[PDB]
């Protein structure tokens, strides 16, 4: 077994990059629900009450 490449550092940076992007994107499409749900309910009022 000889040494492997020291691109360990390359992996450091790129894996960081990718995981921060993951953290950003994951919690983005999450709370869209919190704002859309209230009006998705209010469509009920939009259906009657005149």
């Amino acid at each position: 077994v000889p040494p492997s490449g020291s691109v360990i550092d390359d992996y450091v940076r790129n894996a960081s990059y990718l995981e921060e992007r993951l953290i950003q994107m994951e919690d983005a499409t999450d709370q869209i629900e919190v704002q859309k749900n209230d009006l998705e309910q209010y469509r009920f009022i939009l259906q009657s009450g005149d």
Binding site: A28, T29, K36, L39, R43, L46, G49, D50
Partner: protein
């Protein structure tokens, strides 16, 4: 009414008594939901893949 009902839930709402604004009322957010229906699938697909 406001300062009494805030305690539980005050999701302020009222329709246009001239009930033809109903049209844009529907559409303005119907388009929004149509739009938002996508982000969910797009994000899920990219992340899982």
């Amino acid at each position: 009414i406001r300062k009494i009902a805030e305690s539980l839930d005050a999701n302020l709402y009222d329709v246009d008594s001239s009930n033809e604004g109903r049209s844009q009322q529907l559409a303005k957010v119907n388009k929004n939901l149509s739009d938002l229906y996508t982000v969910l699938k797009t994000t899920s697909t990219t992340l899982e893949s």
